[PDB]
Design a protein around this ligand. Structure first.
Ligand SMILES: [Mn+2]
Ligand SMILES: [Mn+2]
Ligand SMILES: [Mn+2]
Ligand SMILES: [Mn+2]
Ligand code: NA
Ligand code: NA
Lengths: 398, 397
């Protein structure tokens, strides 16, 4: 190997300059385009009002990046006019400073009923067919239902109808985040040595993400050694690296809210025949899944292409272990997981601009797991990798 | 003497792993929480309770996982081990975190998890479901596809369990507060002219980790000078100058239980206005604490703080200069939870309830002063988790 081990912490740090290729933020015109696309989808669904809660969908339509809390902060979009922004009174100044869209502020003091404000705004515009953000807390349904007597639809089709296909600016922001995380993955492999701790790697990866100018360091970071790699959702526990162990690292960051999410699995020292066999199979399943992607292709077909490779090698079938116990991938954007899902049963056709992970992890019970994760986006004629796949068990980077 | 003068190396000699470790919640207490939920369910005519991944699932089952698009949930009915609905591929990991005996019902990726919930309801002849108000609305959509019956809001049941803390819960929160109080103290000590907000944030995370928090700082806000007048403003690096107030709001978790402490202190010489407002903030916090005892409505605690501000000529109500938001919020496995110390909330305080006391004063465009310490209700009054600040230049008792 020329990529694994052999780099000091100081040497890694010389490569950690703030990222010089900064993708442009989403502009005012694009936020308006998103509002207009939602209105088209609302009309198709027969909905005349849309309530978006704080979180990734509020940031999508308005630029407000705040996480959801027990206090209602929401955008109410109707067929005409600037959308209504419902917000705590004490937050008005902070809101003005992050909004990217002209809005009609409706402010509530702490003891006042914010749900009443939503319905009042609906009534003023003669709206009586609300679709509610499926990511919003159920408590908001309770609050609304105290004032509303009409059917409340689930807004998922509208929200996915907008967010699944990324604009060039969105792709560029995801691209930047992916490029940064790919470097961090490379440096993490470089500094690995006998005895190094999983916690030491997590800490360095966060440090590197910050140094490169991520929104907020590592969004998340999973580091697993040896038998711990057999768990897609294993408990964090400190391990120290021994020769002969696989190392699995899954991490990512955000840039203007847009996510990277890359997994590398590589050998420290000499691999066993079994580790070698399963690693090559993982790459082949990932490759086949990618090869299945072009416009019009059903999402489940991408999952099945990966399973076909595993089955031909005598793993599986279906979700059986040794094999692939979960879906092949998930969409990615302002959220770590979003539509479309590359999962059995999903007939959703792939369209240009859709972004998804490609990670058909193999688990061998009691032994290890191998997960390669790279994201792609659909193009007019096929697909494009955000990051190129690994080359070999001891060459994690193309 | 508490502010400035300490080197980074001096501070680090006080950062050994915490030696007074509170005991983790035991198996018997999880059973007590389930039984308490069942009593409250029955009292409300509810025969099934669905708890989603998040702080309530951790409360009842020990599972710490954050919510995702995949349903992970506990279904509690009137009898038998509660049902745990979980993706099949996660069973192994689920087993390793569960603190409660359960009946696992596993779904493969293409299968409908909502169907499992309703199958489990039907098996026990349940048809009066209450649903976790913190769960994604998507779950209502999924359940409604399968149910003709009302899906009630489980907030009253869940709060009825979680608002009053056990001794073990208090001890875990107490440990988190003690650790964060030390980190706050060390942060004041290493402060110096030109120090960066980002530098303080990093130290505070380093300190939380060294002491043995679950995962460093849960959050950390550090603001200098006029920035203190903008509590929810866009973060941007500042460098400290003499004459500026410093506001630090940070916390950690211990076994999931939260600390959340704010200190505001002067670096250098304060102005008369800074001084007078700081004193008023302390007095508002103290009056709110003095109103706390069993039987007092939560809104009276908020009003006690406002009364102090209005007697001094600030406000009234939420007007500025003054207190533009509520006086405080409950705290436990979540940073914010019931009960809320807010106008309109008639909820009577009961022994064991935990809440923040933080009646911040904002002077628009100038500065803000926030003192935040949490308390719990005792049999006859209240107890501070951490003692309040003493002066504008003595943040620690
Ligand atoms: Mn992923
Ligand atoms: Mn990942
Ligand atoms: Mn607080
Ligand atoms: Mn706080
Ligand atoms: Na919809
Ligand atoms: Na991390």
């Amino acid at each position: 190997s020329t990529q694994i081990g052999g780099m000091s912490l100081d040497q890694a740090r010389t490569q950690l300059a703030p990222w010089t290729q900064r993708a442009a933020p989403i502009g005012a015109d694009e936020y308006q385009q998103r509002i207009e696309r939602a209105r088209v989808l609302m009309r198709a669904q027969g909905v005349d009002a849309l309530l978006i809660g704080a979180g990734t969908s509020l940031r999508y339509f308005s630029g407000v990046p705040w996480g959801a809390s027990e206090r209602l902060v929401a955008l109410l979009l109707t067929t005409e006019g600037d959308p209504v922004l419902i917000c705590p009174a004490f937050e008005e100044g902070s809101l003005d400073a992050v909004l990217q869209l002209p809005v009609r502020k409706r402010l509530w003091e702490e003891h006042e009923d914010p749900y009443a404000l939503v319905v009042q705004a609906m009534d003023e515009q003669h709206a009586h067919a609300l679709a509610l953000d499926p990511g919003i807390a159920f408590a908001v349904h309770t609050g609304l239902r105290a004032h509303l007597g009409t059917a409340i639809r689930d807004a998922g089709a509208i929200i996915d109808g907008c967010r699944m296909c990324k604009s060039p600016a969105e792709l560029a922001l995801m691209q930047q985040a992916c490029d940064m995380t790919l470097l961090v993955q490379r440096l993490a492999a470089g500094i690995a040595h006998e005895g190094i701790g999983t916690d030491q790697l997590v800490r360095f990866i966060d440090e590197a993400h910050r140094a490169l100018g991520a929104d907020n360091g590592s969004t998340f970071c999973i580091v697993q050694f040896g038998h711990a790699t057999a768990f897609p959702h294993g408990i964090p526990g400190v391990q120290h690296l021994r020769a002969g162990e696989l190392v699995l690292i899954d991490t990512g960051c955000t840039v203007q809210g847009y996510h990277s999410d890359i997994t590398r699995t590589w050998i420290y020292g000499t691999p066993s025949d079994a580790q070698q066999r399963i690693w090559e199979l993982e790459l082949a399943a990932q490759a086949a899944a990618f090869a299945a992607v072009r416009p019009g292709v059903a999402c489940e077909a991408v999952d099945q292409a990966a399973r076909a490779v595993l089955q031909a090698a005598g793993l599986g079938p279906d979700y059986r272990l040794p094999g692939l116990p979960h879906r092949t991938g998930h969409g990615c954007g302002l959220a770590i997981h979003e539509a479309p899902y590359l999962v059995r049963g999903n007939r959703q056709p792939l369209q240009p601009g859709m972004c998804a992970s490609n990670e058909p992890m193999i688990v061998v019970p009691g032994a290890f797991g191998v997960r390669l994760e790279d994201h792609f986006y659909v193009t007019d004629t096929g697909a494009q990798w955000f990051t190129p796949p690994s080359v070999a068990i001891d060459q994690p980077f193309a």
